[PDB]
């Protein structure tokens, strides 16, 4: 009985020793000669209004012009970022929404949250109205994040400490990913789309495989819940935002942490993390009413996106890298540039 | 300036804004009540007197109440509790008879300490509900309260404790300045529980109105 636990502990020690062996000059030693990105001043080009509650999620369409925002008001507004128009106002059934996702094709938006139901709304109906195409059920806990794969497969992360890949047409759990301990608070998909990483509240992140269906790698090094996660554009690294004010950028190939983006002036948690088009800049939705954008190669803070009157809950960067929407608990989106 | 399509799109945006404003006004006219509990404590009884989130819409005295029974959640409370930052009250059912059962009142008191002192609810009143009065009286007659509260000294008869459990629930409120933990023994009461809820919610609404107004 205890022999299995002893073998597991020995394997964990061996893995830690192997990682230590692969360790070398840190990212600071490599990118020490690189010049700093310089001060980044960023103006609120647009300020979308219309929500009557706290925004909990946002996502940029593939066209980088349309974004869908979910708020505890119960509404799923689809904005037109260029002109601050509202294309649609979906009346979500359950007002407790905590995620949203814009399908790559632009024909679907997903919403979920405390209802434990992932609803797949439709946008290109012949009747000119948004009709719930399918309401996925099966998660025994609050839904945290959902992301479309191409158009029919959608992966979800819920509070039952499991991630699942669905089949929208069938409405059944095609593959279930298990192995986490705490609530899986956030999810992110690799650009290659055959891999994705999830950050659970047990202070650990895992590298899942959509195809075969098991945790390829396990990453640790945090000290609190991982409230957000995002892939590096090259699809070989990801960054996690913990509750201890520490964005950490890991690597898939080396299976190690590279930096710990921390500052003593920050003592508040993290809500969202997203890179830039090249990944040189890494944003972060700190809950102390502002978002701090840091250089992802020297860990130096390089600008502050202040201007929100409450906690910055959701943050996202466009596909072309022309803007960074930040949705705060104040009922206001805000597109920066 | 704007082409025809752009003008019609702005028309659609104005219509969407009008619908959003109307629905927001309708929602604000309603009153939201989070309902916590220790589990089995009697939330069923009070919800009858009126997957995931189990809502309940009941109206009284031309006021639309919304009770969000959240006992079905099994995840960690710290992550989704901030969703209810805006509720005007927190009904908190507690099983009085459970003092000798298994020590469940210690768990209930721990939950009360977690909820009342939570950073998200520094200004939301707690409508404490003490029910199962008949069973509590029968048990108190059978056995004293020293099983769960050895520090208590008294005749160990009902109402001789002077709602001793109620006292221990009230003093658990650390921030007594910015909230009031209303208590009310929930017997059959001839449908007076809804009345107590109404007075408590009205008091909270008055406090909110005065706080907003200058």
């Amino acid at each position, epitope marked *: 009985l205890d022999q299995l636990r002893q073998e597991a502990e020995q394997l964990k020690n061996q893995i830690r020793d192997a990682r230590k062996a692969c360790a070398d000059a840190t990212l600071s030693q490599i990118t020490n000669n690189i010049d700093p990105v310089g001060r980044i001043q960023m103006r609120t080009r647009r300020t979308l209004r219309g929500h009557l509650a706290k925004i909990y999620a946002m996502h940029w369409g593939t066209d980088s012009r*349309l974004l869908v925002s979910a708020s505890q008001d119960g509404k799923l507004i689809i904005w*037109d970022s260029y002109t601050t*128009n509202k294309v649609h106002a979906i009346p979500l059934r359950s007002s407790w929404v905590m995620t949203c996702a814009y399908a790559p094709s*632009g024909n679907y938006v997903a919403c979920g949250g405390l209802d434990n139901i992932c609803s797949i709304y439709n946008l290109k109906t012949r009747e000119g109205n948004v009709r719930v195409s399918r309401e996925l059920a099966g998660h025994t806990g609050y839904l945290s994040c959902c992301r479309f794969l191409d158009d029919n497969q959608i992966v979800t992360s819920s509070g039952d400490t499991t991630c699942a890949l669905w089949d929208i047409e069938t409405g059944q759990q095609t593959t279930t990913f298990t192995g986490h301990t705490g609530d899986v608070m956030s999810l992110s998909l690799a650009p290659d789309t055959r891999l994705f990483v999830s950050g659970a509240c047990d202070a650990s992140a895992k590298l899942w495989d959509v195809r075969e269906g098991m945790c390829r790698q396990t990453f640790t090094g945090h000290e609190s819940d991982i409230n957000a996660i995002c892939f590096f554009p090259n699809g070989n690294a990801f960054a996690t935002g913990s509750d201890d004010a520490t964005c950490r950028l890991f690597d898939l190939r080396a299976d190690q942490e590279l930096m710990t983006y921390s500052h003593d002036n920050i003592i508040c948690g993290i809500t969202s993390v997203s890179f830039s088009k090249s990944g040189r800049l890494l944003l972060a939705g700190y809950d102390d009413f502002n978002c701090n954008v840091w250089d992802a190669l020297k860990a130096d803070r390089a600008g502050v996106l202040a201007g929100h009157d409450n906690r910055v809950s959701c943050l996202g960067v466009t596909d072309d890298g022309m803007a960074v929407a930040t949705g705060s608990w104040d009922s206001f989106l805000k597109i920066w540039n | 300036t704007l*082409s025809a*399509e752009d003008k*019609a799109a702005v028309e659609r945006s104005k219509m969407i804004d009008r619908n959003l404003r109307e629905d927001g006004e309708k929602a604000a006219r309603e009153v939201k009540l989070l309902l916590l509990g220790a589990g089995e404590s009697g939330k069923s009884t009070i919800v009858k007197q009126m997957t995931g989130i189990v809502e309940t819409h009941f109206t009284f005295k031309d006021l639309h109440f919304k009770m969000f029974d959240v006992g079905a959640q099994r995840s960690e409370r710290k992550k989704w509790i901030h969703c209810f930052e805006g509720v005007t009250a927190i009904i908190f059912c507690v099983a009085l008879s459970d003092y000798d059962l298994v020590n469940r009142m210690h768990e209930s008191m721990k939950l009360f300490d977690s909820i009342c002192n939570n950073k998200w609810f520094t200004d939301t009143s707690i409508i404490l509900f003490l029910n199962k009065k008949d069973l509590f009286e029968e048990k108190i007659k059978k056995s004293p309260l020293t099983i769960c509260y050895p520090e208590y000294a008294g005749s160990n008869t009902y109402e001789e404790a002077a709602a001793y459990i109620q006292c221990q629930f009230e003093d658990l409120n650390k921030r007594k300045d910015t909230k009031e933990i209303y208590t009310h023994f929930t017997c059959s009461t001839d449908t007076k529980n809804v009345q107590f809820v109404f007075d408590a919610v009205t008091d909270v609404i008055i406090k909110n109105n005065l706080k907003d107004c200058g």
Partner: single-chain antibody
Amino acid sequence: DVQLVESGGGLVQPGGSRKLSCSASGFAFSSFGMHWVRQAPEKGLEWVAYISSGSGTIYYADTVKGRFTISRDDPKNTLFLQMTSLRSEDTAMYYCVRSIYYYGSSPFDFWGQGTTLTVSSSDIVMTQATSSVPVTPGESVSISCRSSKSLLHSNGNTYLYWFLQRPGQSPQLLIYRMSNLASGVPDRFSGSGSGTAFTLTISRLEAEDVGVYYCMQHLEYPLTFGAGTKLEL
């Protein structure tokens, strides 16, 4: 299914009045703008009137300004056009067209069956030089419709639409915004061009594509249709 049936036709004495009504059927009428397009017994189409979503702003053609009145009844899902003092030239068969306006939408998506009416006895001038052109099946054809004003707005959109009308059939949309194919249309059709110069391109023209092809501006709201190019043989 989405279907638009309009009624209120029949012979009317000149100078009289008549109400024409459209009957919506299951396409969320209240959030759909509606137009009224007329077809002369031998000539091309011509815009008549328009009522926005929610009975908001409303426009008319210069030829029928004041004379005609258009109204909608959302609870009844029915669209009314009230005409007064019908003239001899007013004889035409009137089509009932829906259109929804938002980013990426497809205005003029569906056309009603049409109501035949007979009467007893700015303004960007679009042009279709080619009146007709025969073509054998399986070949590629190109129809050019030159405008008289730059249709490329500052937003980058090119507000040109292409409509194909089968013989004795309600016209249907083919391409909107000069490049975006309609939903359900075959991929053979393709539009291109530039400001003040457009040319629809169809490759491997199969059967059931013969008919009058119309081009349409949407910049200046006194819309104008093309003369119409017919495909034969």
